[PDB]
Design a protein around this nucleic acid. Structure first.
Ligand SMILES: [Mg+2]
Ligand SMILES: [Mg+2]
Ligand SMILES: [Mg+2]
Ligand SMILES: [Mg+2]
Ligand SMILES: [Mg+2]
Ligand SMILES: [Mg+2]
Ligand SMILES: [Mg+2]
Ligand SMILES: [Mg+2]
Ligand SMILES: [Mg+2]
Ligand SMILES: [Mg+2]
Ligand SMILES: [Mg+2]
Ligand SMILES: [Mg+2]
Ligand SMILES: [Mg+2]
Ligand SMILES: [Mg+2]
Ligand SMILES: [Mg+2]
Ligand SMILES: [Mg+2]
Ligand SMILES: [Mg+2]
Ligand SMILES: [Mg+2]
Ligand SMILES: [Mg+2]
Ligand SMILES: [Mg+2]
Ligand SMILES: [Mg+2]
Ligand SMILES: [Mg+2]
Ligand SMILES: [Mg+2]
Ligand SMILES: [Mg+2]
Ligand SMILES: [Mg+2]
Ligand SMILES: [Mg+2]
Ligand SMILES: [Mg+2]
Ligand SMILES: [Mg+2]
Ligand SMILES: [Mg+2]
Ligand SMILES: [Mg+2]
Ligand SMILES: [Mg+2]
Ligand SMILES: [Mg+2]
Ligand SMILES: [Mg+2]
Ligand SMILES: [Mg+2]
Ligand SMILES: [Mg+2]
Ligand SMILES: [Mg+2]
Ligand SMILES: [Mg+2]
Ligand SMILES: [Mg+2]
Ligand SMILES: [Mg+2]
Ligand SMILES: [Mg+2]
Ligand SMILES: [Mg+2]
Ligand SMILES: [Mg+2]
Ligand SMILES: [Mg+2]
Ligand SMILES: [Mg+2]
Ligand SMILES: [Mg+2]
Ligand SMILES: [Mg+2]
Ligand SMILES: [Mg+2]
Ligand SMILES: [Mg+2]
Ligand SMILES: [Mg+2]
Ligand SMILES: [Mg+2]
Ligand SMILES: [Mg+2]
Ligand SMILES: [Mg+2]
Ligand SMILES: [Mg+2]
Ligand SMILES: [Mg+2]
Ligand SMILES: [Mg+2]
Ligand SMILES: [Mg+2]
Ligand SMILES: [Zn+2]
Lengths: 65, 98, 63
RNA sequence: GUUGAGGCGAAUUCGGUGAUCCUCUGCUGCCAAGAAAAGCCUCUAGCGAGCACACACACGGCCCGUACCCCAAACCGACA
RNA sequence: GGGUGGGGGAGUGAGAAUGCAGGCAUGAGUAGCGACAAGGCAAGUGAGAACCUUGCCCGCCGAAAGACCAAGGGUUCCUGGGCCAGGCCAGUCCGCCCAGGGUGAGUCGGGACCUAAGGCGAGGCCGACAGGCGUAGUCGAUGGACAACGGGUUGAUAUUC
RNA sequence: GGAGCUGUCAACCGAGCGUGGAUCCGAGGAUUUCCGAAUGGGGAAACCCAGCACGAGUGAUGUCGUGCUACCCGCAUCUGAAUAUAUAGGGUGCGGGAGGGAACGCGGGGAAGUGAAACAUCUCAGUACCCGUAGGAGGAGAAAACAAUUGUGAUUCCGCAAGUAGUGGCGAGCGAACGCGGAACAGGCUAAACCGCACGCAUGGGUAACCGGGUAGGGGUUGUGUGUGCGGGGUUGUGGGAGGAUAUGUCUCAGCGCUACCCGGCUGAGAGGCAGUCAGAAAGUGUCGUGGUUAGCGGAAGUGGCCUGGGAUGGUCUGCCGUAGACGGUGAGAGCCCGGUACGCGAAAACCCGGCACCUGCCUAGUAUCAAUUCCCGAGUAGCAGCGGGCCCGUGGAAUCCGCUGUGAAUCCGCCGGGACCACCCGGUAAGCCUAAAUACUCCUCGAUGACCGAUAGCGGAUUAGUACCGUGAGGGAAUGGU
């Protein structure tokens, strides 16, 4: 998973693009799991956690980091 | 904060009825139960870059099961049935050939 | 009628009524509340209040 | 015809009888004298520089219910 | 986990309260097995068949014992399995148990439209407190307004596809 | 903190993470659907439908995201209906409330069963219940008090006094105080007279004879008199203040008080002293703690022999520690096997407490003497009468205290109390406010304990427990532990 330390250099738009990419990846993983071709089921939790990480970074950046 | 259409569409429905509809080019999804038809249509068009003819929705109550002494209820779901425009590019479900 | 005074807030009192055989039953002591149309300035608009005769006897209100 | 699905497919005229239905929120009679509001139409107050209409094309039509029992073994009666 | 001795303290002794809780007898393999429509044979399945499946007879309802709703119920619906509990007998069957599936609406019934009886009720009036009543208003169908018919299809939905 | 981990019934798997520090423990922050006081409107709680603003999206309606939008109260501002003054009302902006909680507090309303061997007075009992409203406690609290020839000196709580004096269909019952011994101690602000200052009114609407007093003039008109507010002054019972005459300037300075002078006085500033999060004024900001709380770490001594045994922690020989022989686990009674125990270390950060500064505010001459002429000392109050309540006191000769109705005072030569009342004497100073501690309780959080229970017991609840089930509902409410 992407680390907060290496996340904290993207300014705002790179963070937003990363969040969009992560949401798309999570969507794809959900579909693959639904149709039964996903083997490593830990990927869903990993992607959910990195989405939460990006959201946390954005929010704390807004609220006087 | 920023809303993504992929938050509305959860997963595709895989069953004999869904496979039958796939030949007719009609796709069944599980959607977030609070969504409405127009929002679903907009979201599908955005996600798959496709043209949508109409959206059909249905709410299904969860089944009740008993485990050792009492009853527990599964979650209720909402299904959206989406029919593409007459001549649109098919949606590639990525593992649902029917 | 209207057992509470609008100015001093005086309310009813509770006690007993005692007969010849000394049977005691509950009753009330109500203040002598009278209707008054009170003006704030000379020639002003009148307002209806419920005040007690003690407040009337004192210069607490004016017609 | 694995008795599932398939393929083909004629003639279809004239009478009788006849409503608890329709014309009929009508008609006739009677006294016991028989909802409201929206909707629709119209009047002006008002607004007003752009309008109203015809045709064609392309579109938007939301939320909940929809399974099954329902003079019953699935409802009310502790019970098929 | 106990015995004995010197002391200390008790929720310290049950056979009866038409006592309470649990277990178990007697009645007894006894009564009953829930309408007066009625069942039979052949074949099948199976370890097991009066009751399940198929066929053919016979009988009963037919202003219902047929076909649709509303209220109510809530997965009882379909498919595939099951057979120690349940079904007043047995059961291979099931409204029972297990898994998966299944309910598609611009026009149907409702809301987003309207109001009745009635409910709540800004201010308000009344009432020691608690509170009572009620205006503006806002809810409230069993009523008003408002646009669809015929056919086909699934194991399971259809005026919805 | 240091090697495993992905909670449990509750296993089976599957797939992964971890010394580049996982899981886990503590603190702070972020996220936080919908309902609920629920508050944009509606509603059968967890559902429905919006308005405005800003963004997103669409060919455009549709659609999405985020904020704000209840009512009432207070304050500040704009407007001033009928209607003129104006007010009601309305708009805008700021604050505040609402509801919940096991017990404890305070104020108000207030049963019956029962006892009286019946029963109404009485009791039960100011209990149960209800309403209002708090706080970590609350209420009370600083003498208009007791006492009695002496004196004590705010309040509260505990033990006595005492089942006493008394009271009572003198029945059943009920039941003080004085004073004594203790716990804990604490006292402070105001109103009023008077003097100034601002709004308002009468009068001279100029004869104010006032403008700091006076020493003489100056404008001679703004003085004079009261109400509303802000300052100063005042706070006492041996009465005290206000007002007068002898009697003086924490320290200084700028202004001003009509002018030249004495004495001033006022405002502002600087200089010093004091106090401070407090009842006596209210906040905030840094820094420092041998400070404390919220994770934790270390911590001595048997692999001893033999016997029995599945197994030693048992028996018997032995060795040792002990500031540690608490408790529990481990294949049977373990100080030396394990977690631990005695004892000792430990805090980024947050919070609590304390200290020091910043900061805040108060003090800027009045002390005494005399005068006894005047003013003030909390009003529809006290007192009195009627009807009640409560005090040991059940209306009695009934004081003291509280309520309603009526009548209705005075300011120290006043007024109130000392159990009808009167005279004398003694005490005190009502009708304004605040106040720590000693006292009450435990929903809850830690740490302990038991001549308490041990599964029909102990909580209803060791088990799916306020669950299953019963009831329309308010409510009622189980059973089931052990290889
Ligand atoms: Mg979110
Ligand atoms: Mg359609
Ligand atoms: Mg639908
Ligand atoms: Mg089942
Ligand atoms: Mg009132
Ligand atoms: Mg009584
Ligand atoms: Mg009076
Ligand atoms: Mg249907
Ligand atoms: Mg149907
Ligand atoms: Mg029905
Ligand atoms: Mg039944
Ligand atoms: Mg024995
Ligand atoms: Mg003994
Ligand atoms: Mg006994
Ligand atoms: Mg016995
Ligand atoms: Mg017995
Ligand atoms: Mg017999
Ligand atoms: Mg028989
Ligand atoms: Mg039968
Ligand atoms: Mg046979
Ligand atoms: Mg069936
Ligand atoms: Mg069977
Ligand atoms: Mg049987
Ligand atoms: Mg009402
Ligand atoms: Mg109201
Ligand atoms: Mg109404
Ligand atoms: Mg309605
Ligand atoms: Mg209707
Ligand atoms: Mg059907
Ligand atoms: Mg944590
Ligand atoms: Mg609401
Ligand atoms: Mg509401
Ligand atoms: Mg006016
Ligand atoms: Mg409260
Ligand atoms: Mg009685
Ligand atoms: Mg009696
Ligand atoms: Mg008796
Ligand atoms: Mg508090
Ligand atoms: Mg207090
Ligand atoms: Mg003063
Ligand atoms: Mg004053
Ligand atoms: Mg340790
Ligand atoms: Mg051995
Ligand atoms: Mg042991
Ligand atoms: Mg031990
Ligand atoms: Mg006084
Ligand atoms: Mg009196
Ligand atoms: Mg009395
Ligand atoms: Mg008396
Ligand atoms: Mg009086
Ligand atoms: Mg005397
Ligand atoms: Mg007080
Ligand atoms: Mg105290
Ligand atoms: Mg028990
Ligand atoms: Mg036992
Ligand atoms: Mg029920
Ligand atoms: Zn009054």
């Amino acid at each position: 998973g992407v680390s907060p330390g290496e996340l904290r250099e993207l300014t705002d738009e790179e963070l937003a693009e990363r969040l969009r990419e992560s949401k798309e990846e999570l969507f794809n993983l959900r579909f693959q799991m639904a149709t039964g071709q996903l083997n490593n089921n830990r990927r869903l939790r990993t992607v959910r956690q990195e989405i939460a990480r990006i959201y946390t970074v954005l929010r704390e950046r807004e609220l006087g980091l | 904060t920023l809303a993504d259409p992929r938050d509305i569409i959860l997963a595709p429905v895989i069953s004999e009825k869904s496979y039958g509809l796939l030949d007719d080019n009609v796709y069944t999804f599980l959607v977030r139960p609070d969504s409405n038809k127009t929002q679903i249509k907009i979201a599908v068009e955005k996600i798959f870059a496709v043209k949508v003819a109409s959206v059909n929705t249905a709410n299904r109550q969860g089944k009740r099961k008993r485990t050792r002494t009492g009853y527990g209820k599964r979650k209720s779901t909402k299904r959206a049935i989406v029919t593409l425009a007459p001549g649109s590019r098919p949606i590639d479900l990525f593992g649902a050939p029917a | 009628m209207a057992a509470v005074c609008d100015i001093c807030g005086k309310g009813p009192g509770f006690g007993k009524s005692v007969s010849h055989s000394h049977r005691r039953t509950s009753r009330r002591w109500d203040p002598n509340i009278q209707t008054v149309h009170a003006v704030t300035r000379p020639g002003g608009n009148k307002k209806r209040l419920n005040v007690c005769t003690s407040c009337i006897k004192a210069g607490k209100i004016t017609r």
